[PDB]
Amino acid sequence: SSPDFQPIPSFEECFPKSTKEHKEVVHEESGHVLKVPFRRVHLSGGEPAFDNYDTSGPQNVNAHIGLAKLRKEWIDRREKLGTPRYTQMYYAKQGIITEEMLYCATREKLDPEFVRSEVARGRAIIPSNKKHLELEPMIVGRKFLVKVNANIGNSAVASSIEEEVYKVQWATMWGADTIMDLSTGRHIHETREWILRNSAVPVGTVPIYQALEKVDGIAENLNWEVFRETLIEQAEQGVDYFTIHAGVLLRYIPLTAKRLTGIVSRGGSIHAKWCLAYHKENFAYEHWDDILDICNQYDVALSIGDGLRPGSIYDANDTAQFAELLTQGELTRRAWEKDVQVMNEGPGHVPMHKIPENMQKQLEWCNEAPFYTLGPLTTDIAPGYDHITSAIGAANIGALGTALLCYVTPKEHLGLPNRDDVKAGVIAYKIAAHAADLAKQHPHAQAWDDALSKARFEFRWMDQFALSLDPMTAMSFHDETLPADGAKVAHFCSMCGPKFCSMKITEDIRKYAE
Amino acid sequence: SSPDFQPIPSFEECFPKSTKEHKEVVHEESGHVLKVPFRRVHLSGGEPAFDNYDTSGPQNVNAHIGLAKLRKEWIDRREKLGTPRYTQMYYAKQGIITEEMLYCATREKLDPEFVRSEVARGRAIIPSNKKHLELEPMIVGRKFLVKVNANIGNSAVASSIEEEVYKVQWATMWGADTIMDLSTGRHIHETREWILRNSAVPVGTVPIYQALEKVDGIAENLNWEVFRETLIEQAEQGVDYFTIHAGVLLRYIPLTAKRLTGIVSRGGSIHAKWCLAYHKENFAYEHWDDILDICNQYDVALSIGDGLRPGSIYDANDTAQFAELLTQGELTRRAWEKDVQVMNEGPGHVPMHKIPENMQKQLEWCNEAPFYTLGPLTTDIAPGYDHITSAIGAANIGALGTALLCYVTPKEHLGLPNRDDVKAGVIAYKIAAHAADLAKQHPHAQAWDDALSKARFEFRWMDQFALSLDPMTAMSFHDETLPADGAKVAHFCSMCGPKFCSMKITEDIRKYAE
Numbered sequence A, B: 001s002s003p004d005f006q007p008i009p010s011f012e013e014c015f016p017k018s019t020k021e022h023k024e025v026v027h028e029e030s031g032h033v034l035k036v037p038f039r040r041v042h043l044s045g046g047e048p049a050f051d052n053y054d055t056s057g058p059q060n061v062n063a064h065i066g067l068a069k070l071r072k073e074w075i076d077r078r079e080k081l082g083t084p085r086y087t088q089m090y091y092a093k094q095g096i097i098t099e100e101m102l103y104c105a106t107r108e109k110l111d112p113e114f115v116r117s118e119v120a121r122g123r124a125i126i127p128s129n130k131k132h133l134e135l136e137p138m139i140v141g142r143k144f145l146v147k148v149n150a151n152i153g154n155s156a157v158a159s160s161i162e163e164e165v166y167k168v169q170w171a172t173m174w175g176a177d178t179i180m181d182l183s184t185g186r187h188i189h190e191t192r193e194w195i196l197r198n199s200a201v202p203v204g205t206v207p208i209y210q211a212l213e214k215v216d217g218i219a220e221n222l223n224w225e226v227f228r229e230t231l232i233e234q235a236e237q238g239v240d241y242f243t244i245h246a247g248v249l250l251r252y253i254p255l256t257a258k259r260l261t262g263i264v265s266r267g268g269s270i271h272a273k274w275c276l277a278y279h280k281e282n283f284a285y286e287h288w289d290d291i292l293d294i295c296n297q298y299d300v301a302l303s304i305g306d307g308l309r310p311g312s313i314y315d316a317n318d319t320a321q322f323a324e325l326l327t328q329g330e331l332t333r334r335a336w337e338k339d340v341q342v343m344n345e346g347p348g349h350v351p352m353h354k355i356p357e358n359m360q361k362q363l364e365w366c367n368e369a370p371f372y373t374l375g376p377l378t379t380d381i382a383p384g385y386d387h388i389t390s391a392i393g394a395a396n397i398g399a400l401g402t403a404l405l406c407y408v409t410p411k412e413h414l415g416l417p418n419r420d421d422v423k424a425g426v427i428a429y430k431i432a433a434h435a436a437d438l439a440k441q442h443p444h445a446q447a448w449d450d451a452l453s454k455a456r457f458e459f460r461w462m463d464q465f466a467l468s469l470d471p472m473t474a475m476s477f478h479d480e481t482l483p484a485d486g487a488k489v490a491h492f493c494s495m496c497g498p499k500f501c502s503m504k505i506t507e508d509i510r511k512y513a514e
């Protein structure tokens, strides 16, 4: 009821020379003024300031009070107008550009009509439960910037409410575009409430985890009714998207019998246990229409789970995995008939040569719905470094069109990630996501690389650091060998020294040619 | 003359449950017995021990004494037989399978005739100067395991002989297949001597660095003669390969005028400065034949430099870069006419969509000579994390056929890497190289992933750690939350806890189905 919340390091400490800014735009139908966040990096030497994306949200807000309910007037006005369904897809299909769509368009530097079109056709989603009034809207889709999710949450073995709220603020400081609260320990409802009220980014959950808690860990005591009540509980708090493993069908379970690592999905294994116990079809599949009815009233997006994802290179792209993908497509099309926003969850552990098949089949079988991958990890050999093994896969599958990359931290396979691991995972995934944006030739993505590289060539060291994903790491690393203030304007570093610095030699070469 | 050498952590500390082993094979022409190293990971639960590659070399050897001269009898016998040229390519073209070829074949689990064929056709090299008698032979080529190079060496600003020798032993402990001594500071000759006498892996250099030192940093005072004397000096010590920027032609230099980051190659910028000073063709290009004559007498392989590699995403795949690549192909074919072993150096900073063009053009224009890339870095945005930005590129270009991946450490663009950075870079690159082996479906590569994943599924925690690239990191990370001995056999970790562990649920599912 009153956790001992501690503040994360300030925006200014994390991003020296940056300021938080907002672009003001007017939603013309309503007259509502939207303040769309961005981060301005102030540079030297006559360079214009560099504007970048900003997920960090409002700063220095007491977590006991929570964030401003910025969407309140939007939601209240739409309610007063009256509507049969509350989803961004419903509105988009009516030809309506909502505040959320305009906010996202502004944030992406794209046309609001283009945003509306992408949402209406099911190729992008704006996860934005009407009860998450604190949310700064964002969009997930192949035509937009590649996004990153940070998974947090406690377990029965580790962590606390205070630490999980810290982790959400911290994850978003470093660039997480969404978070999920995957708590499987104590105080699931309360932890999630504190997170939602203090999160400017979309928050996802996997409702089956709490449903299993509601029945004291006895999977056989799950059923639709327990699950339904969990969905409503979570929707009422403002959860923006639910992972639901409705594609783990009874008949697909035996396809996993010869796998090396079996069913590694937590939710998938829970559904599989129930299905086998009763020899009955997955209750989330059976009640898909009823789930859609809930989602329509709040705008909860559905992230259709991949409970049969491969958990080892050995199992990659096997029959079980693709059987579920086929069903994910069926469920996607059914959700769209009710105007429910959908993305599809994907692998997993997948060696690089098997990555293209994953994207090809998803794009076709799921009608281009946004894809949301866990990595993939490209090799199993390096626990402790699975942020790297998976950054390779995530960058690759992102380049092929994957819209949301679920991070993997250095603690993958080993233990619950702490705040440091969360940062490491977010950084690795921001690298993968941006590398993918470059590969897709996404408009203006290279401007960031160019600004940093120009600062590098010109020996504007502080500008170089300020422009990077993690300024203080770059600065500290440089300063381990050359800490003096004068070195911040030196035309070399300790790698080559003054006489061998190649950019300084180029500098002399060009001066001589002048 | 007598540095204060300090020992690296022991093999046993780095690789718990592993032993160093050797496979004995007989070179039939000579009767020489070869002892080819490997590392055996001892496992539990009736698993056979897992045998892996091992670059760590002989352990606990006093650096003041140096390693055993294991190749002495091979070299002495060939000298007594008499030969006009001393290169592995010369021998291969005569139809001779040398000790080096058999050693490599054994190490790669491939046929010695296949090794001979690959070397004869120029598609693989065995860098193995006859004066590097301490060397455990290895092969670089697309048909073999993807290899990793670690760059070390001092600068005028940082490090020492003791620290550089430590770094070579340390780099190879973690998996470096070759190293380069890139020293640009004090005691270049001595540093390199200590390294060669204590390195079981091939050692490369960039001779122009020391040549520039010989003329007191005045590039205009370089010339062929200075360079020639440097080549002979380094060859006499046992350097296995030379990076020579002979493709930086006078007429290519103006192609860099509009680049964002100019010429980032150290050697390339030195050659460019000289060429512009005199308006004369690159002296290494002009004297290519004379360089080949030197290489033939020692078996120094040539790593044809890419002095015009791109140093920013902006500059990737530009005219300057590919002009040099075309010349690298000419130089390659010329070297082969004299039976000199060659690889080609490649980029650089290259966004992912531009990676395939790099491989396509190199394979064609350079007649499938082994390619040796620096990364590539797939984005410029994350100094401090360029081992990750480049692991993505290295894995990708490795998958397309690149044979040797030059590492990039977290200190790239920032300062001279220390011993910790060397480890981080090697690990990241071993991940990239192995991920590439998997993508190429290289024989038996997946056995490693499978063994670790089997240990993971079966909760053989110590086996899992022992099988990984960095066992103590994995173990320590797990133990941050579950340090008790009993947790090493627990069917969960702190990520999910006992009630939500998906592999344990799969375990129950399969037991129930039994």
Ligand SMILES: Nc1cncn1[C@@H]1O[C@H](COP(=O)(O)O)[C@@H](O)[C@H]1O
Binding pocket: A151, A180, A182, A206, A243, A264, A265, A266, A267, A268, A303, A305, A306, A307, A309, A345, A346, A347, A348, A372, A373, A374, A406
């Ligand atoms: N993104 C993704 C793809 N596959 C799984 N996930 C993520 O993994 C979690 C669900 O895990 P599980 O399937 O193991 O219950 C959620 O964070 C979900 O988005």
Ligand SMILES: Nc1cncn1[C@@H]1O[C@H](COP(=O)(O)O)[C@@H](O)[C@H]1O
Binding pocket: B151, B180, B182, B206, B243, B264, B265, B266, B267, B268, B303, B305, B306, B307, B309, B345, B346, B347, B348, B372, B373, B374, B406
């Ligand atoms: N592998 C590679 C590809 N391009 C450059 N390198 C490596 O970078 C160094 C040469 O650097 P430079 O060209 O800057 O003189 C040597 O380690 C060389 O193998």
Ligand SMILES: C[C@H]1O[C@@H](n2cnc3c(N)ncnc32)[C@H](O)[C@@H]1O
Binding pocket: A151, A152, A153, A154, A155, A182, A183, A184, A374, A407, A408, A412, A413, A416, A417, B495, B496
């Ligand atoms: C299913 C994906 O989410 C990760 N995962 C599961 N639970 C948590 C948690 N509480 N915090 C962080 N990551 C988690 C898994 O390790 C896998 O990557």
Ligand SMILES: C[C@H]1O[C@@H](n2cnc3c(N)ncnc32)[C@H](O)[C@@H]1O
Binding pocket: A495, A496, B151, B152, B153, B154, B155, B182, B183, B184, B374, B407, B408, B412, B413, B416, B417
């Ligand atoms: C040319 C490539 O080698 C790296 N490099 C240059 N000199 C050294 C050194 N002494 N030690 C380690 N890496 C070095 C550069 O940073 C680049 O990655």
Ligand code: MET
Binding pocket: A264, A265, A266, A310, A311, A348, A349, A374, A412, A413, B495, B496, B502
């Ligand atoms: C549910 S925790 C374990 C998740 C597993 N590492 C995976 O690959 O999905």
Ligand code: MET
Binding pocket: A495, A496, A502, B264, B265, B266, B310, B311, B348, B349, B374, B412, B413
């Ligand atoms: C010579 S030190 C700088 C090297 C540079 N970072 C490159 O991309 O090659």
Ligand code: SF4
Binding pocket: A491, A492, A493, A494, A495, A496, A497, A500, A501, A502, A503, A504, B264, B412, B413, B414, B415
């Ligand atoms: S010294 Fe080498 S690493 Fe440092 S700025 Fe110059 S070119 Fe870059």
Ligand code: SF4
Binding pocket: A264, A412, A413, A414, A415, B491, B492, B493, B494, B495, B496, B497, B500, B501, B502, B503, B504
């Ligand atoms: S608890 Fe989750 S992360 Fe840990 S071993 Fe089980 S499946 Fe893996």
Ligand SMILES: [Cl-]
Binding pocket: A413, A414, B456
């Ligand atoms: Cl696991």
Ligand SMILES: [Cl-]
Binding pocket: A456, B412, B413, B414
């Ligand atoms: Cl640099």
Ligand SMILES: [Fe+2]
Binding pocket: A264, A311, A349, A413
């Ligand atoms: Fe996994």
Ligand SMILES: [Fe+2]
Binding pocket: B264, B311, B349, B413
């Ligand atoms: Fe660089």
